[PDB]
Amino acid sequence: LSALNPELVQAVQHVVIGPSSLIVHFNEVIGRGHFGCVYHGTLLDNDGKKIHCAVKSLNRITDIGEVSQFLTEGIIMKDFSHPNVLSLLGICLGSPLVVLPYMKHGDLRNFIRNETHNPTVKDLIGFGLQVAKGMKYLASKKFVHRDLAARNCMLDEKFTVKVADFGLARDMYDKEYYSLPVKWMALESLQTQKFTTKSDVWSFGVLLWELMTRGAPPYPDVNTFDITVYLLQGRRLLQPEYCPDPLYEVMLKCWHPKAEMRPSFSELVSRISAIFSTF
Ligand SMILES: Fc1cccc(Cc2c[nH]c3ncc(-c4cnn(C5CCNCC5)c4)cc23)c1
Q1: 262 among annotated binding-site residues
Q2: 205 and 136: one domain?
Q3: How far apart are CA 237 and CA 126, in angstroms?
Q4: Domain termination residue (choose one: 78, 101, 124)
Q5: Ligand 1: distance of its center to the CA of 31 in Å?
Q6: Which domain holds residue 113?
Q7: Could you tell me the CA-to-CA distances from 36 to 85, 107, 125, 203 in Å, in that order?
Q8: For residues 206, 209, 211 and 212, what is the CA-based torsion angle, rounded to 10 degrees?
Q9: End-to-end CA separation in angstroms for the chain
């Protein structure tokens, strides 16, 4: 730790959580191992208020070169703050730690799939509008997500959706064993391996479809290899049973073959809030 550049150490100070500010409960995992080694933690603020948090041990980082790089992704993610984006509470310098807020209802996909939960069409559209608000913010900062899907959004105790699985919160589903999300990808990303805000808009379209079907898998009868030819033929996901026609018009616009013809996230927020307001 002494070996790190002093000007870089000074730069990351605002992101660092001191060991006397955090109680990590290494004896209790969050979400029955489905999110890897994520533990409950208690973070103390400047006034001593207790904050329930989720603590991820970043096992991939070993050498000083990697520590220095992760320190930069921390500085960048710390500047990202919005009600519909998962915030980075801080980092701890064994393994470096990533401290994230605790999300009572886990991931959005599992929540909408759970038989015991009964969100209305309005509630589902509200979740979609929340995701659109989070993405409008990321897009405003020229940040391209590359893996937007319902499994990658989280829900807190107030049912606020937080876009996640980006920056230091990426590989959210990395499970350890002892022995590309092509169905959410824009046609041009499948052909070029390049990603833009316009390819996030296509992905948002599929997540909208996921919300309106209460988490059904997209294109269940189509192989990942066959998705390109299927999309090139002009075939698209069909209108869900309980989905308003203007909302399906929105989804279809997200899947337009010409990237420039797709709505921006600011247009999606405008259009979806107008639809939400009719309920
Ligand atoms: F972008 C990320 C990067 C790394 C990790 C993570 C995961 C993560 C962060 N904060 C969390 N806070 C709570 C839960 C969680 C899991 N399951 N549950 C409930 C669900 C209802 N049943 C009881 C358990 C709550 C998971 C997380 C995200």
Answers
A1: no
A2: yes
A3: 21
A4: 101
A5: 6
A6: 106-277
A7: 21, 14, 30, 25
A8: 170
A9: 56
